[PDB]
């Protein structure tokens, strides 16, 4: 029943993980598998593989955490964590790092009240106590901004003359610590996984850019793909895993909401990065500002990322705040498809005066402002306070210099959001079982790199009519559960 | 009775203004006057004069405002304003610019309540209504941060779901506008005044650094000054007007509190500076953050200065907040005198990563943080608010880019504070009437450049025993009043 030939479009998280899974399944050793990508991962006179700097996985760090709410994504990334702690994370591809999870509102133990961004943490805190051995007694909690600042070796921001508010219903930064978190060098991870796939020798890799799907004369099936250079590749099954370009290739402007975000890096000195690492510097997440910081990484940099648009929706929802649908979203992406710069990420130009020099400069201004406020509130000498906060006797000058340091580099990365934030790993219903879609990674798919190819492979086999494939032993989510969660959205077809 | 020979040490605000006054008084055309300064204002193959980049007057802008509280400094700078609007401000040396005066607390018309930094404004607002024609009806008032932001062509920072607080006793940024304010190009001003003094031909100018005073064998009088190069200059009267170095030259570690401050400049494009000027961009003073902004200036830059240490004392006092005496202040300056970098200002080095590279790097961190917070609160897309402030449909992208732009240059400037913030323009009582001190400019002396030399000259003549000198007509402050206000502090002598 299984397919006899494959074309995988996209050597990213979904596609390259699929190629790897099929390379381990001996039932396909004789079958022809083609993995085509725009980017040449093995250019001439290069040692090993180089990752695609325009892909959404191109980053020296990606955050892997798994205290997400109970569900299928709950059990999926703890399974992935076993690989990040094993062979996938060897040679420093994975790093462990405590994570400080924070927001603004009333005390963390106090029940959720409306209109407080802490409610996103209170949900993550209540669940963290359930999974972590020891329960709520083994989970450290910081219940004020000045506790978070002290936690990093900084001074209090609160003015001296004003008295500390004992009321636990007043507004302040609230936060908890989780130790079973870390980050992976996403680039080096892809490069290693790529070298692995090449060694197993079961997969043919092709440099080329897919321009159209190809159908038969009846248009009841997909034969393969047509490249921009003329070549036409044919196989029994064609898998679209092109990241942010998938809606374009598939011709479905509503399948994903595609939009870019800017990411900032501050370079540290060897001495500074050592100082923070000795302080056990954590990954810092502040959902009230929409900013998180990771590092110091393998380049001795602190990376500052932003909550995506869909991500801020969830935070504000948990606080009983509706936000409108994203401007210029969903089908509006189609007028951009002709631009080769759309869905194309990587380094961003900087002007003489230090501005972002990019055709999407205005989109960058909000992220950069949030990053600087996040920095000053935590690492600056007075938090966000004015002159009534005295104490110029009291400061950590190393943290202050970081908080005033201009961003050293800026990069651009593209999201690929779905309505329910669920992946789409299913068959296009119009063409029987000849065209498979594996995309919609939103803003959280990289962590599942080691296991997503396997789950994707079982979905390819099951929904062909064969129910023999069931997933091993008692691993949850179930294969039947996953086929539901990543069903092809048919609303768009009719 | 008048002196027969002069030595003026310091071609700055006090000294150069004195030389100019004596150059207009015909009673001294035959008398020998010497103005010695470390810096050569007329170097070879240079056209005209160049200002001393290490002096405390070396800046492309200095703020001239005169709605200071009622008193002698009240009537003194309105007199000076007539010259800034006349010959002293010709050839663009003076610029007019509205001024937005602001702080944090309850509504501006509401009476002062304790612990609110607005109280400094409420005093300045209540007095502004007294001098300005029309009274309180002719004075524009902005009573919320979102009114100040709207006043500059920016969006509201307040979140949409939260409702506007109608209570006028809640905390917010409050501010008023004064139109009779501006700024002078301090450097070009000194250079012109210098060329004026040279043309009148009555004053001899000497390049050299004073190392010690010289006394007679009885030490009941001062003969002159000894230079580092050996030269000894003699005159009947020696005038110490060496700015921040005066305590050193005089050997009185307690006479002034000497400390540096860092100043920041963001460069604008021609189009941006034009846009703000078309918007009637004001000088912005926020005493809650201790920051003010001036420009765009003649280089198309925005300059960000900080309230001095003594200046923040006054703001917090008006709010019923005592602050301790400055660390490392007053007599502690003496261990620095041997360093040629002490009391020496000008451009500051920037590291590879963009840090301030200066032996006083830690002192800079507070000012730079305050500057960025001031910028973001007023010009950033969300003020200081987080993600609950939506409205990414709504932004002024030009203001946002400025608020994210790294500081282009940083300079250092030294203050020269007194206990009561009053100048010291009097005779050293120990040496009869042979040694005169004209220093202690604190942080507000530059504006008085056109008239301070005249007032200084009358004080030189009066306190010699001759009461004939009285100051013309009915100009206040009185000469007797000024001799009191700038009396030599004898507490230090006994
Ligand atoms: C700033 C940012 C931060 C993120 N943070 C996190 C995080 O902390 N943790 C986390 O787990 N995830 C995170 N994500 C999400 C994660 O990086 C993505 O979900 C993941 O990269 C999805 O990969 P993909 O396979 O869908 O596409 P990608 O990884 O982008 O790869 C797609 C590949 O398909 C190729 N392709 C595209 N079009 C064509 C064509 N026409 N022909 C041939 N080839 C083509 C591309 O060249 C590319 O190589 C983040 C994403 C961004 C942008
Ligand atoms: C950052 C900053 C912002 C300010 N803001 C304002 C403002 O907005 N408005 C305002 O009105 N004022 C302001 N002030 C204050 C004003 O600039 C000063 O009060 C003014 O410069 C005082 O001048 P002075 O004559 O005392 O000394 P200076 O103007 O510094 O000149 C002193 C001169 O004496 C010379 N000298 C020193 N030692 C010796 C020696 N041993 N031998 C020979 N010569 C010597 C120096 O070389 C120098 O040329 C500010 C000051 C600073 C630093």
Author numbering:
A (entry chain A), B (entry chain A): 2 to 495
Authors' own words:
Recently, it was found that a biosynthetic gene cluster of Aspergillus fumigatus harbors a gene, termed fsqB (fumisoquin biosynthesis gene B) that encodes a flavoprotein belonging to the family of amine oxidases and catalyzes an oxidative cyclization yielding an isoquinoline ring system via C–C bond formation. Thus, the reaction reported for FsqB diverges from the canonical reaction scheme because the imine is not hydrolyzed but subject to nucleophilic attack by the catechol moiety of the substrate. Our study showed that FsqB structurally belongs to the amine oxidase family of flavoproteins and has an active site that is similar to well characterized enzymes of this family, notably MSOX, MTOX, and NikD. In summary, our study has shown that FsqB is a member of the family of amine oxidases, but in contrast to previously characterized members of this family, it combines the oxidation of a N-methyl group with the generation of a heterocyclic ring system.
